[PDB]
Structures are given as structure tokens and as C-alpha cells.
Design a binder for this molecule. Sequence first.
Ligand SMILES: NC(=O)c1ccc[n+]([C@@H]2O[C@H](COP(=O)([O-])OP(=O)(O)OC[C@H]3O[C@@H](n4cnc5c(N)ncnc54)[C@H](O)[C@@H]3O)[C@@H](O)[C@H]2O)c1
Ligand SMILES: Cc1cc2nc3c(=O)[nH]c(=O)nc-3n(C[C@H](O)[C@H](O)[C@H](O)COP(=O)(O)O)c2cc1C
Ligand code: SF4
Ligand code: SF4
Ligand code: SF4
Ligand code: SF4
Ligand code: FES
Ligand code: FES
Lengths: 112, 72, 277, 425
Amino acid sequence: YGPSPFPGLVDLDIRLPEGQAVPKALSNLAEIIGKISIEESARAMGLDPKIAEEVALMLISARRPIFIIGGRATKSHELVTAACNLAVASKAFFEDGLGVVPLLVSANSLGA
Amino acid sequence: STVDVVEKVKEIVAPWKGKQGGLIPILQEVQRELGYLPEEALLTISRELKMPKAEVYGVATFYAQFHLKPRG
Amino acid sequence: MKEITLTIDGKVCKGVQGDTILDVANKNDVYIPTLCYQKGLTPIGACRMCVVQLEGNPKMLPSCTTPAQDGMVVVTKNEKLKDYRRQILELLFAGRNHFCMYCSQSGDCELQRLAIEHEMDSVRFPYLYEDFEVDATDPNLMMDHNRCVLCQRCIRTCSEIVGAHTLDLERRGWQAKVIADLGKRLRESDTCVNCGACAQSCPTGTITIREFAYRGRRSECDAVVESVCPLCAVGCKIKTYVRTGSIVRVEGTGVEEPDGGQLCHMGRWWLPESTER
Amino acid sequence: SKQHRIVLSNCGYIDPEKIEEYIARDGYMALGKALLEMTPEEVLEEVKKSGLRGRGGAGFPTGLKWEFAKKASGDKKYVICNADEGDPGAFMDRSTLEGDPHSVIEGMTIGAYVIGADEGYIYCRAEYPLAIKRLKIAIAQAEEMGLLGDHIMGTNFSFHLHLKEGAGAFVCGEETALMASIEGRRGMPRPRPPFPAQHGLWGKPTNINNVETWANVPRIILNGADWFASMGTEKSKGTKIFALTGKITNTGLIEVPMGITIREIIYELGGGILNGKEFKAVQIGGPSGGCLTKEHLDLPIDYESLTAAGAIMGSGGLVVMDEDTCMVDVAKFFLEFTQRESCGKCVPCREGTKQMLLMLQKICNGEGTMDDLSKLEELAHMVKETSLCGLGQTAPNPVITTIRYFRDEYVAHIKDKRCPAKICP
Ligand SMILES: NC(=O)c1ccc[n+]([C@@H]2O[C@H](COP(=O)([O-])OP(=O)(O)OC[C@H]3O[C@@H](n4cnc5c(N)ncnc54)[C@H](O)[C@@H]3O)[C@@H](O)[C@H]2O)c1
Ligand SMILES: Cc1cc2nc3c(=O)[nH]c(=O)nc-3n(C[C@H](O)[C@H](O)[C@H](O)COP(=O)(O)O)c2cc1C
Ligand code: SF4
Ligand code: SF4
Ligand code: SF4
Ligand code: SF4
Ligand code: FES
Ligand code: FES
């Protein structure tokens, strides 16, 4: 729910309305591990069925995707897990870990 | 009108989206239907092909056939 | 084999079958004049100062783009090569307007050092006095096209290393120029991140960081210390230059890592601005 | 007059649009005997002994280039036909694509069969609408008959052509600049050792060739190779299209075998200079080519012989000069062309070409000293030996060749301040 930090390289801007979109996202990616329902999991996400449908369609056609999770999502420790679950629901694996790559604001994170 | 050229070049870049090449023919056909390449045309070509503005201006000013100003 | 050996300047050098001659030369210690070559960028081939010839073959080969092949003898210094390199430098000086007296890089410019090492004391050419634009619209970076060698190392750094493809070449021929987006000034360009990777890549004094002019010369420093940028988590390796108890220049070590040495606006503007608080 | 026509053995005794007229004269037979009779290997080795050197100007054995392209990694190849003839005076090649596009289509198809190329491109300037039109309709009229589509002759071989319209530059005729121009970039040449046979269009191997060497692979296949090697001297075997122009009586395109003395070219083929004047010089290789004078009258015209005479073979334009013409002005005109068509990537060309133009302008205008001539000679040699693309290596050709044969005519501009051109103060 931001300014699309790359206005000119993105081809799918999905603006989520606030509230409790975390369970909505986690149930949405639940279908991608099993079936790969969507309408019921795409109401608090503020997306008409079609928008979430082709979101999932582009997410499934990618052989090696990656997710960039920002510091805004840390307003609730639930949305971080939601991103990390969207990572496993699309087989975004690397030999060092998942494709989550969090953006920490300092360097002494574990130290602090 | 600067708003006419937007959609008019949208319809010229349509047959070329996601085809890995063919930018100098796009510029050639925008030169054929306008006599020159305005800044609006180049900006919209860059936004549609998602090719940087520096590249499209470099290739537009590389060839003598093209023109960046209205010709006499 | 993947293990070849050449003879540069009589000195036998070791290398790998995949590299170029300039890489085998730099690998041991051997020196070859270079102006458009930058470690971390694909060889370009523009200045033609790295020319080198073999025994028997009278042709001249660019040591930075020609591969190394076991059994070849390499000659870097002779009368012909000195003459040709001095002619190239004199062309570069007579074409553009080089005023070393007030250049910010007037003691750490690659072109000036190459001119002094070749004993250049005259240009021999009619000194085309052309009018080139000086772009000082951006408060931080200055582009004085009177000092451009057209090595394109700024266009390669903002494209392959940074991604913000803000720079490219304008009209071809002698009228070649390094422009921002759609021929605009740097301040009007929206696709710029103000990283200064172009200022670090420029060998001449065309692109220059403005607020540390005349102070951030690497030749008149007091100490060079390498450390890490504390501001963010990426932790880029730096090459702090200290002069009279003040940081005058922060350069990005790591032209081998995927970052490529490009530091953020903070890493190379706030850190030297912090020592004067 | 009397000349051997191989490439243009169709000219006007054919219909330029309808293909069955063309096939009525052994049109596509070669393709058959190369796609249904021979193997994809012998077709290469029998071309390799035909001695067909690259008619684009270099003079490289096309068999070797085809061997380099065939023995490549990965399964994706290309074949390109360079008709971006930018020399104003080298209409040699547009006339071929306008006369018989189907022979060039045959050549590209044979190349695709030998090398193993799926796709193929042709590069024509948008300034030549006639050739573009005729080729766009000829490829269609040749795939309808099952010669340019999928499963040609039903033999596991497909070959599509995409006619690419060039933008209009002269530097874009080199291999690397052409490859960059197809990919939607600037025609800025790149270093050679990664040749355009291991790494070409989109990284895939390519086999860029000229249109007149493409127009020769069809005939050397059908008429054989021992026959094609019986019209050369000892090294360069075949015919060559020449554009004889300038102050000559008979101007146009001629087709002479290789190893012909230049006298026959200007004294008995064109019939002499276009007045009762005498012959002074002849430029052989278009703008970026040397100029030969009366000491070179019995020297056969080859690839190796012209090089020793400072003149390159490329664009094939033979422009003749009267006795009145001055060689300082000739050099300036042919260098002012190569300056405007320079890329601006290498220092030697971007700078030395402008500087040589200025030196020639001041030597012709009477303001020249005696050491500016030495400066000009050394600058020519430096630009020739240091430049990246062949444009910079052959642009200071009309200065070296005009100084090595007309040195007295230059010194006369420094000492006696008068010019034999009788045109300028
Ligand atoms: N309009 C024109 O036709 C025109 C204009 C100017 C000059 N020219 C000619 O252009 C030439 C400039 O040289 P050039 O650019 O042709 O280069 P070049 O002389 O090096 O060309 C050699 C040819 O052989 C091929 N080749 C060589 N070694 C190879 C290898 N190992 N693997 C694969 N392929 C290999 C090259 O790809 C090229 O086709 C001059 O000879 C000049 O006469 C032509
Ligand atoms: C400035 C320049 C322009 C050229 N223009 C052409 C051209 O228009 N057509 C062409 O076939 N070759 C041209 N060449 C030569 C190319 O290198 C050519 O593609 C190459 O020699 C392969 O053709 P070939 O094997 O028939 O010689 C040009 C070379 C240079 C340096
Ligand atoms: S860029 Fe270098 S050569 Fe040019 S004026 Fe500045 S110090 Fe002198
Ligand atoms: S400051 Fe950074 S983004 Fe801007 S031109 Fe220089 S390198 Fe490119
Ligand atoms: S600005 Fe600097 S790096 Fe860029 S082309 Fe000019 S001299 Fe080279
Ligand atoms: S230079 Fe910038 S990106 Fe790199 S570690 Fe420092 S703050 Fe982070
Ligand atoms: S440094 Fe080797 S060619 Fe530019
Ligand atoms: S050309 Fe010699 S007189 Fe001007």
C-alpha cells in the first residue's frame, strides 16, 4: 500500500487495503501448495477475483522468483511470516535459504 | 496535439511489445507519420517498451534520417 | 590447458587461456597504458592507448581486448608505440579544452598522467576551440564536457553496475556527447539516484563531486584506510581518503563483487560530510 | 563491351517479380541438388575449394567462415545478408537485389542448410524502397512454392526470412555495427576476437556475408567448383561487379574477372576519359579506398595486389579523374565523407579525421607549412594502425595514396603556392 517504489519497471501494482490482510495472504498462498476459494481469500486484499487470479498465474509461471520484504511489513510480525510463506508456496529456494531477503535498516541487527 | 501522439504511438508500439528488438523500425514509423520525433513520442516509446530514455535518445540521434525538431 | 605463458617486455608471465593480454600484464606487475579500461567493466576499446605489437607481425593489437595465446612475444615500449600514443594524447588535448590550471582533478587525472609520462609539451594540432556545455545544474555533481575523452566508463557504470540508465551517447561522430535522459540536464533527469558511481568511474575531471572539489585529490592525501559503511545493512567496503583530519573522498572497493563499488548517496556524501560537523 | 557476367547473368533478360520466369533459367535447381542430392558436409567442402573469397571487401574464404559457423555450440544459428551499401557510387548491390532477389534467397537458404541456421535476415536501407518491395514479394512468392517455409522439400529443414529495413548509416555496414543495429542499439563496432561466428545476434552464432557472395553460392553449387576456379589468377577466383563512374565515357556496372589490368578497365571498356583529356588517377575502393595512377596500369586487380598499392577493394566503386582534378581536393572530399559517417567511439578516428580534414583544407588554401605534410602523413599512419573498425583503418587511405604518388603535387602547394586544379586561389 505504497507509492510503487519503481514507477516504470513494475508491470503489476497490487495495492492492499489495510486491516487484517495477513490471514488473507496466507490463505491465498495455501491454495498454491495444494490446488497448484481464491475469491473468499481475496476480499480484505481489496482485489476483484480477476486481479488476484492473474497474480497467482504470474506467480506460478516463474521458475526462480524472489521476494523483497520491507520494513513497513514489520508493523506486524504476521506479515513477515506471510511473505515467508508466499516464498515457500512458490518454490523460491536457494542453497543459502529462501528467497525473502529482508531489508534490515542497520548492520548490527543480531548484535542489537 | 501532444495528447494525440501519445495514443497514436501507443498503436505503433503495440505490434512490438515483448519481441526483443525492433526499435529503429518503431522510430522509423513514428518519423513517417509525424515527420519528426518529438519528446513526447520518445518518452512514451520508452515507457511502453520499458527501455531507458537515454537509449532511445541515443539511437534517435545516432542516425541522420531522424529529426528531433519539426522539419521545414 | 587453462595455464598459458607469454613474454611481455622479455619478462615471462603466467596466465590462463581465457584472459586478455592486459590481464596477464596486470596479473604479475607489468605496466601498460590504459584510459578506457576499468576493472569490473567489460573491455570497451576506445582510447587505443593499450596498443601492443608482437615480433614478426607488424600489426598493432589492443592489449585489453585481444586474448592471450601461449607462445607470443609482446612488446609494450618502442619508438613506434611511443609516437602513436603521444599522437593520441595530443589529439585528445587539441580536440577538447583541457585547462589543468583550475581542473579539480589536476593532480589525479589519468589523461594528465599519461601525458606527463609521455613527455607531452606541445599538442602539434590546431587546437579546435569548440564550445562544450558545462552542466552544473545538479547541486552535487558537475559534468564539464570540456574534459571528455569519451571512454564511456560513465555510461557503462550507470547501466551494468547501477541500473539507473541515465547516461548515453548523443549524436554520432565528433559531436558525440554524454547526455542525461532525453538530452536534459542532470537535475531534470528523474532516473538518477545520485550515487556518484559515474564520478568514481570517470578517469578525467568531467564528472566531479562538487562540494569536495580541490580537496578530494587522491594524490595529496595523508592516509588511505579501508573499512565498512555503517549506515545500512548491505555493508559496502569503502576506501576512505583522509587529509588533515578530514574525510575528503569515499570510494567503493569491491569492483569484483556484484555491488561493483557503487556506494549510495549516503555512503559517499554523508560520510565525508560527517567529519566536518 | 566484352565482359563475363556470372552474378548478374540475369539482368533484364528476366522478369523481376514473377518467379517462374526465374526458374525457367536453372533458377532454384542448385537448392535441389544441394538439399536432395548432396550431404550438408560435401556442399561445404566443395565450396571451400571454389576459392570464393568474400566479395564484401575483406576477401576472406567463405568456406572457412561457414566452417566456423557450423562448428559452433548450441542449437540456434543465423544467416545475414549485408545490403546496407552506403557508398554513394556503389549501387552495385541494390541493383542485384532489384534484379534477381531469388538467387540471393537461394544463397541464404544454402547457407542455412550447410551451417544449420533456422532463421535469416537481410539488411536493406529504407532509402531503397524498390529492392525492399521486390524482396518482400519475392520471399512470399518463393515460400508459396514450398522453397522458403517449413519443411522445405519435406527434409527436416525450415528457413524463414525477416527483411530488416536499415536506418541509413555507413558505419552500420560492418558486421558488429549491423548486429547492434538489428538488436535496436547504436551501430558502434565492438572488438573483433569474439568474432560474429562464435557470438553474434543475441549471442547466437551468425554467418554475416555480402549479397554478391550470396549470389555466387547458388551457381558454384550447380555449375560446379572446378569451373569457378578457372576464371581467377592464382588466389582470387571469380568475377567481381565494378561501378565504373566519374569522368568516363561509359558509366555503369560492369562484371570483369579478377586479375584484370586496369588499362582495359578505363582505356577499352569505358572507351577513354569523357573528353580529349588524359587519365590522372582512379579511386578503386569507394570513399575509404586508395587511388592508383599511371604507374599502376598493368597491375592486375586482385585482393592482394590492391593492398600493396595502398588501395582497398570495397564498395568496388572505380571513379576516374581528369588531368585537371587536384589530389588534395580529392583526398579532402573523400575524407569529409568518412568524417561525417564516423561513429565517435575510437579516439584515432573521432579526432584524427577532423584534424586531417583541417590540414588538407589549409594545404589547399595556401596556408600550409612544410612540416604539416609530415604531420598529416604520420596522422594518417596512426589512424590507420590504431583505429578499431575498418572505417578508421581505411579512411586515411586517400591521403597516404595521394602523398605516395602525388608528393610533388603536394609540395607544389607549399613551395609555389599555386594549384594544378586551377579552381581555387
Ligand atoms: N560498403 C562496403 O562494402 C565497404 C565499405 C568500406 C570498406 N569495405 C571493406 O571492409 C573491410 C574492413 O574489414 P572487415 O570489417 O571486413 O574485417 P576483416 O577484414 O577482419 O574481415 C574478415 C572476415 O572473415 C571473418 N573471420 C575472420 N576470422 C574469423 C574467425 N576466426 N572466425 C569467424 N569469422 C572469421 C570475419 O567475420 C569477416 O567476415 C575492408 O577490407 C574494406 O575493403 C567495404
Ligand atoms: C565501415 C564499413 C562498412 C561496411 N559496409 C559494408 C556493406 O555495406 N556491405 C557489406 O557487405 N560489407 C560491408 N563491410 C564489410 C563487412 O565487414 C562485411 O560484413 C564482412 O567483410 C563480411 O562480408 P564478406 O565475407 O563478403 O567480406 C563494411 C565494413 C566497414 C568497416
Ligand atoms: S581532466 Fe585532466 S587533462 Fe583535462 S584539464 Fe583536468 S587535469 Fe587536465
Ligand atoms: S549519480 Fe549514479 S545514477 Fe546518477 S548518473 Fe551518476 S552513476 Fe548514474
Ligand atoms: S564523462 Fe568521464 S567516464 Fe564518461 S565518457 Fe567522458 S571521460 Fe569517460
Ligand atoms: S554505501 Fe549505501 S548501500 Fe552501501 S552499505 Fe553504505 S549505506 Fe548501505
Ligand atoms: S585501453 Fe586497451 S583499447 Fe582502450
Ligand atoms: S585543390 Fe589544388 S587548387 Fe584547391
